[PDB]
Design a protein around this ligand. Structure first.
Ligand SMILES: *c1nc(F)c(C#N)cc1F
Ligand SMILES: [Zn+2]
Length: 198
């Protein structure tokens, strides 16, 4: 078992926080975010856009890191990893180790860390300013196991912790959201929001 990174929201000096698109809950949806649950629902290995919002521009060399932890207290010391099936299915893009649950899509500067002390996985990219005509920068994540994968997440809820870091890895900001990776994200978001309203 491993030490548990903080999940405490921390806007920091740059006013760092996440944002999510409004994709709705139709059958064709592959990634959908519930503000009422603070929970992203997505399909396996599909694009998950996450917005990075800041009040002021952080220095060049600022990076942004994603890491998964188990939400429940009896599981939070366990490293989140891909299940024994998906870690062996040879689907690495050449950067992501096959054990890593979270990948970054479409960024050749993504770096993947296996922490030498905690053995936790994370993926980190340079934080870049918004493009022209945009108010935020967007990262595309992929989740490479289902929440239900036996021997992996095994139906246990996870959180993704997003940290803004300086070039040394020191904390500048932190935010987080729950994730369910499932075949029917729109149907599952509708169900869980309906459960919350009852
Ligand atoms: C990461 N890096 C940046 F440079 C900005 C700006 N501006 C935002 C961010 F999330
Ligand atoms: Zn799996």
């Amino acid at each position: 078992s491993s030490s548990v990174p903080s999940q405490k929201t921390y806007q920091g000096s740059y006013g760092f926080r996440l944002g999510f698109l409004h994709s709705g809950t139709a059958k064709s949806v592959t990634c959908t975010y519930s503000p009422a649950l603070n929970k992203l629902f997505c399909q396996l290995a599909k694009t998950c856009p996450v917005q990075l919002w800041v009040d002021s521009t952080p220095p060049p060399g600022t990076r942004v890191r994603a890491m998964a932890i188990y939400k429940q207290s009896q599981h939070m010391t366990e490293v989140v990893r891909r299940c024994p099936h998906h870690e062996r299915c040879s689907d690495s893009d050449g950067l992501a180790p096959p054990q890593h649950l979270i990948r970054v899509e479409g960024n050749l500067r993504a770096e993947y860390l296996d922490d030498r002390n905690t053995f936790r996985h994370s993926v980190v990219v340079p934080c870049e300013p918004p493009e022209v005509g945009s108010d935020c920068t967007t990262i595309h994540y992929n989740y490479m196991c289902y929440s239900s994968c036996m021997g992996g997440m095994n139906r246990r809820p996870i959180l993704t912790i997003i940290t803004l870091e300086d070039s040394s890895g020191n904390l500048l900001g932190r935010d987080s959201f729950e994730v369910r990776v499932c075949a029917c994200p729109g149907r599952d978001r509708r169900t869980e929001e309906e459960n919350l309203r009852k």
